[PDB]
């Protein structure tokens, strides 16, 4: 998790490209062919220029930016399916699968009108687990990933 | 980037360039300087032929990038249908 600096940033460099730099790099450090050497020739080329031309500094950054972004979108959607994951969030977070909750509310009702204690946190995770099976939803995937929390004592 | 930042210096024009030829260089320089920054794109008698050769190519290219990448004409027609 890196950040950006402004109190040391140059003057003639705009913050817009500064943000572009901060993203194109972190998208590599986190991520742990021909798209590698050719840009090295581009950067080296600028080192030969006897005059710093911002109008050209962006035409090399933005292409590098758009290439990694195009490469990242390929993974964030196709390989790592986002649609399936968003479909999970809409169902459970946003009450998309409301039919699961009317049963969970039907069961785990008396154990919540009382003030919360140190034991109620587990008294509901089971009831929620009794619920998913009560709606014939049988999937060991994405079932243990959902853990209800009880903000107790603060 | 057209109306200002470019001035024809009446004092430092060489005698061997007619006053009209000095307005075809200030227009070819401006046409390329403006093609890079704002448009966001990167690429005697024989002397008179060089100015015109650099004119009938740069300007003809400035319209192509200004009609395909921005459709300057398609806005004039659309600005008559609605605004007029």
From Swiss-Prot, chain A:
Q: In which tissues is it expressed?
A: Ubiquitously expressed.
Sections of the chain in a coiled coil: none
Which cellular compartments is it found in? Cytoplasm, Cytoskeleton, Microtubule organizing center, Centrosome
Q: Offer a single GO CC term for the protein.
A: gamma-tubulin ring complex
Keywords per UniProt: Cytoplasm, Cytoskeleton, Intellectual disability, Microtubule, Primary microcephaly
* Highest taxon listed in the record's lineage: Eukaryota
Q: Which GO terms describe its molecular function?
A: gamma-tubulin binding; structural constituent of cytoskeleton
Could you mention a single GO BP entry for this protein? Answer: cytoplasmic microtubule organization
> What is the role of the protein in this entry?
Component of the gamma-tubulin ring complex (gTuRC) which mediates microtubule nucleation. The gTuRC regulates the minus-end nucleation of alpha-beta tubulin heterodimers that grow into microtubule protafilaments, a critical step in centrosome duplication and spindle formation.
Which disorder is it associated with? Microcephaly and chorioretinopathy, autosomal recessive, 3: A disorder characterized by congenital microcephaly and chorioretinal dysplasia associated with poor vision and nystagmus. Variable ocular anomalies include microphthalmia, retinal folding, retinal detachment, optic nerve hypoplasia, absence of retinal vessels, round areas of chorioretinal atrophy, and attenuated electroretinogram. Most patients have mild developmental delay and mild learning difficulties.
Quaternary structure note: Component of the gamma-tubulin ring complex (gTuRC) consisting of TUBGCP2, TUBGCP3, TUBGCP4, TUBGCP5 and TUBGCP6 and gamma-tubulin TUBG1 or TUBG2. TUBGCP2, TUBGCP3, TUBGCP4, TUBGCP5 and TUBGCP6 assemble in a 5:5:2:1:1 stoichiometry; each is associated with a gamma-tubulin, thereby arranging 14 gamma-tubulins in a helical manner. Gamma-tubulin at the first position is blocked by TUBGCP3 at the last position, allowing 13 protafilaments to grow into a microtubule.
**Family classification:** Belongs to the TUBGCP family.
Name of the protein this chain belongs to: Gamma-tubulin complex component 4
Source organism per UniProt: Homo sapiens (Human)
Show which stretch of the intact protein is covered.
256 to 422 of 667
Swiss-Prot record, chain B:
Function (record text): Component of the gamma-tubulin ring complex (gTuRC) which mediates microtubule nucleation. The gTuRC regulates the minus-end nucleation of alpha-beta tubulin heterodimers that grow into microtubule protafilaments, a critical step in centrosome duplication and spindle formation.
Q: What is the name attached to this protein's record? A: Gamma-tubulin complex component 3
Which organism was this protein described from? Homo sapiens (Human)
Which tissues express it?
A: Ubiquitously expressed.
Where does it reside? Cytoplasm, Cytoskeleton, Microtubule organizing center, Centrosome
The UniProt entry's sequence similarity note says: Belongs to the TUBGCP family.
Q: Lineage from the top down? A: Eukaryota, Metazoa, Chordata, Craniata, Vertebrata
Which proteins does it associate with, and in what oligomeric form?
A: Component of the gamma-tubulin ring complex (gTuRC) consisting of TUBGCP2, TUBGCP3, TUBGCP4, TUBGCP5 and TUBGCP6 and gamma-tubulin TUBG1 or TUBG2. TUBGCP2, TUBGCP3, TUBGCP4, TUBGCP5 and TUBGCP6 assemble in a 5:5:2:1:1 stoichiometry; each is associated with a gamma-tubulin, thereby arranging 14 gamma-tubulins in a helical manner. Gamma-tubulin at the first position is blocked by TUBGCP3 at the last position, allowing 13 protafilaments to grow into a microtubule.
